[PDB]
Design a protein around this ligand. Structure first.
Ligand SMILES: [Cl-]
Ligand SMILES: [Cl-]
Ligand SMILES: [Cl-]
Ligand SMILES: [Cl-]
Lengths: 156, 190, 149, 156, 149, 188, 190, 188
């Protein structure tokens, strides 16, 4: 009989789980196709460096930035890469608009099983952010330790 | 690292092909209430629905891919979607493209001189992943057209998509490395 | 009964067509005011800017898509074009977003059946880009083959 | 008794005219202050070129881009310029959110003195776009004519 | 009776405080993972990236304000920080915009009395920036004077 | 090639001119329900509307550009829009600018020394496209003053706009190439 | 072009100062219905409201800067706003800053060696424009606290702000040019 | 200056440690209306809540972290949240990390050759700030499970988080400078 507060992951509520899974799949596919059409041709290569910066890691970064409405320091310059980028931009426009239409209403749904947003409605976002910061620190420290071991091997 | 990359590409291509074939063949795509006799919990795939638990356990019935009466064809989009879902053209196309990529990988291993075969394999794997995406979207949309869950065949298909994309990336990297080595050797010989 | 392309509902069909025409016109005018003057070329000579027709189209698309690009007009006329296109984009995109929010509030989660059309468009674009890249690679390979003989 | 359709400049309806005038004044002031804090100091100068690109024209361009949610190819790097940029960013966020909250509703108000948006509701935006394109062409042609006259004077 | 700073109403005060704390923490972590390693410095030496603490704060502010900046992280840890901050920013800004639309839809045009507070904040920021620039100029002038004697 | 570019520019200019001339003088801009004498399916244009069925089929009635019965006069903006739509000033202006651009292209071949003729033709084509855009917006907006479909004359105008923009791009490219060749000769 | 810049700066500074002084002194800021007896159409400024047309034309009454009864001293924000509006601190501060900038320009025209005076004039002009912005916002907000329109004194103040910003830009440009010439001469003499 | 930077790092570390130790140990985290015996204004902390007025002034009561009368048990998420809030794991963990950072700073003060200790201290301070953020969020969220105000212990914790972040930045800067000097001496 008690009212059910929305979960700690309530920011995913506006879209169905199938939409989220297909979004992840589309992001992976777009990044892979961007890398493919940017780097496969030997005529795009000049030791030898490519004419563009769109490797697989950079392609994933560009696609993630485009979906987050942020942007990076690089942008596709060829016809095929720009086709990929433009269709990804259109997809992002539609999906982000649909998601953010009613996010605040979705975050405060009380289920039977206007007002300001409370911190309990975004505590999950905050938890994910702190976890990401901690994981980034862990990765950086692991890389530093590995490089120190490699330097020790070089000096021995 | 070329041999390790070759082995990883071959293993991943085989894994993705096998997962996609198993997902297409099997019928654990969706868990939902229904009947397998021409409301009980049933598991259904792309072709057949079968009842779990209850009294008619083990009975499999072919999915009626054209439900509802009055056969309204005024909207051609819905009929097109029903035809695409019934044929399962996109999952089978993904299976075929995965097999073609594996065949290209094997032929390149046998030839080891023609670099375009590796590019063809990578293209085939990327296209297989895209076909998997389209098939997943079509299947979910057709189901939309009552608590339910997805079985292990659906997640096998999803993992097949992921592995196919990884193998396509690896094959493109191998093509790039082969052309880079060719250019470096040409520079050295000049 | 919304269709696969029901995400285009908030704007009428005429608005979409005029949007395409306006994008084409702004891109052409940007290229024209950027490249026509012989005094914008320094010493084939090189232009003082990167706003060719293809890059102008890319700039206009990036501006309308709320993404941006790697170049920006520097001259007065090019910046007038860019500013008026920015104003147009802000108004049109804001109106589309507000009308879409109204359309979706006629709290139920959106299902995949409502965005399947945009997914189809995305996959078709990816296939088209791959096809264009493959055709370009084949043409370059044929050019190299005839160069070698 | 006939219902009066919204005017051709109905995109200004969501904000009062006083807000619009104050927005113009704030934009001018921010551009001027950005140029001042970026260019006044002789220790920011190296014939002699400044360490930054924030002249008055470029400052106006940066401020317009920031208010338009677009951006440009330059960004302030000093502490003073970044304070101006950040406070202008906060201003832009608040004002643009308030403006775009109910734009679609404001564009289709029938006054006695959910449907798709019609083209007549945005014909004014289209008119302003075409006028801007024509004015840009006129300015470019005038500049070309002036430079041709100067070249002829140099030759003679 | 909405106040002068009523544009902060859609979010609670604790959310704003935690937003400031999160901005500070993300900027510090970005600087740390970008600059701590001696192997990211090449030959005072110069870093392979531009992500000092001041630039990290600027990048974080630009990301949260939907404006961007002139730099972007390139390493794995820096990009993890940037991606998680992008996700946080998207969620928080979208929620603020949606709740502001709900607050404003309690069609009457907005009056200047509802945004005078943001105008005051803007003018105060402009004054503070001018003061900081003048103080820096005076300090550099004093340094030049003591250098010349 | 210069010859290929000139041929494309001339062919596109002529095609755009013909398409817009047919658009401005044809009665198939819009399909809707109405009356062809003084509700049945009718095909309408800039000047005349004619029904497709009934006893009155094939008879056209001049468009009531200033209806004093259904709206009984309106504000200044509505009357201004009605006057602009009735005059069809922007479609005819686009026709005129396309014709002038074609004349400039033709005259430039016999005046190869003159360089600003190509630039003037490109400006004319771009302005013709812009006038096309304004005319389309005016027509659609005035139609609003329950199911209708646009005819092939409307899409003829759309294709004419696209072709005019392409031909303007080609003309500006030719101007750029000619000035590049002049600068190269100056260097030599 | 230095003399032209000097003349433009002086003329613009004088114009902005005069416009702001006239706007502060005059009472054609707002056209609204009201009374001037210590409902008819009236025109009011920062200090007075005066009746036009009607029978009591020409009568001017001091604005009651603290209206409404019950003197609700609960929120300090409303009292602060009313105090700022009544004092007109920001328009008068803009006038004072414009006068200070003009004085700096006049002193610079005499010394012709101390470059820091021109920077001071530019700073004064920019700050005067900012004070004008703040005063306009405060005045409109206090009015908000019935069709109305703004008289020519309001637009005189707006034009004064615009001209003050232009003159500040010009003065900063002059300071930059002076330092650039100083640096170039120092380079030449070395 | 290296001495100035070291003094600032040590002073900030000690100040943050003291501020957060007082924050975790005082009874002024929140002001609200409640009962401190067995609806009057009361001041609350992490463990106890005293009333500031009335007949029961000065009597603190242990906070009911698991109330079975006004909530009568809840779901897994609520139980986990109230367990985290009751344990106060994140504030105490922030205290511990600040203490270990100060210990590392002192150790490096009497171990000048070892360089990774400064990096460890900076990592400890950054982690202490992150733990501060998590603890603040947990406390505020658990308070939700009608007018209230936060006391000076809460703002003591907030300023401790800020100071910890600043000291971590200073420590990383010292580490960078030390490695810069090392590589400069290696170059020479
Ligand atoms: Cl099956
Ligand atoms: Cl007709
Ligand atoms: Cl007065
Ligand atoms: Cl306590």
């Amino acid at each position: 009989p008690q009212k059910s507060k929305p979960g700690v992951f309530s920011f995913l509520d506006p879209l169905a789980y199938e939409i989220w899974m297909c979004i992840v799949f589309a992001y992976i596919g777009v990044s892979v196709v961007l890398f493919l059409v940017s780097r496969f041709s030997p005529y795009e290569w000049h030791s030898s460096e490519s004419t563009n910066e769109f490797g697989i890691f950079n392609s994933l970064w560009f696609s993630l930035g485009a979906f987050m409405q942020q942007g990076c320091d690089i942008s596709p310059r060829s016809l095929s890469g720009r086709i990929v980028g433009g269709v990804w931009w259109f997809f992002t426009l539609i999906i982000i608009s649909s998601y953010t239409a009613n996010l605040a209403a979705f975050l405060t749904v009380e289920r039977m099983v206007t007002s300001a947003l409370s911190l309990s409605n975004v505590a999950g976002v905050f938890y994910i952010l702190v976890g990401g910061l901690g994981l980034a620190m862990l990765v950086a420290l692991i890389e530093f330790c590995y490089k120190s071991r490699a330097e020790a091997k070089r000096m021995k | 690292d070329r041999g390790v990359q070759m082995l990883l590409t071959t293993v991943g291509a085989f894994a993705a092909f096998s997962l996609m074939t198993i997902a297409v063949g099997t019928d654990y795509w969706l868990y939902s209430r229904g009947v397998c006799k021409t409301e009980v919990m049933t598991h259904s795939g792309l072709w057949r629905t079968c009842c779990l638990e209850g009294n008619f356990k083990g009975l499999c019935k072919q999915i009626d891919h054209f439900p509802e009466d009055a056969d309204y064809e005024a909207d051609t989009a819905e009929y097109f979607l029903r035809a695409v879902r019934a044929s399962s053209i996109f999952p089978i196309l993904s299976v075929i493209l995965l097999f073609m990529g594996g065949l290209c990988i094997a032929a390149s291993e046998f030839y080891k001189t023609r670099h375009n075969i590796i590019l063809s394999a990578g293209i085939f794997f990327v296209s297989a992943g895209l076909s998997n995406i389209i098939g997943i979207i079509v299947y979910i949309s057709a189901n939309a057209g009552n608590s339910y869950s997805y079985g292990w065949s659906f997640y096998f298909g999803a993992l097949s998509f992921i592995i196919a994309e990884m193998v396509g990336v690896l094959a493109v990297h191998m093509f790039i490395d082969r052309h880079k080595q060719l250019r470096a050797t040409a520079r050295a010989t000049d």
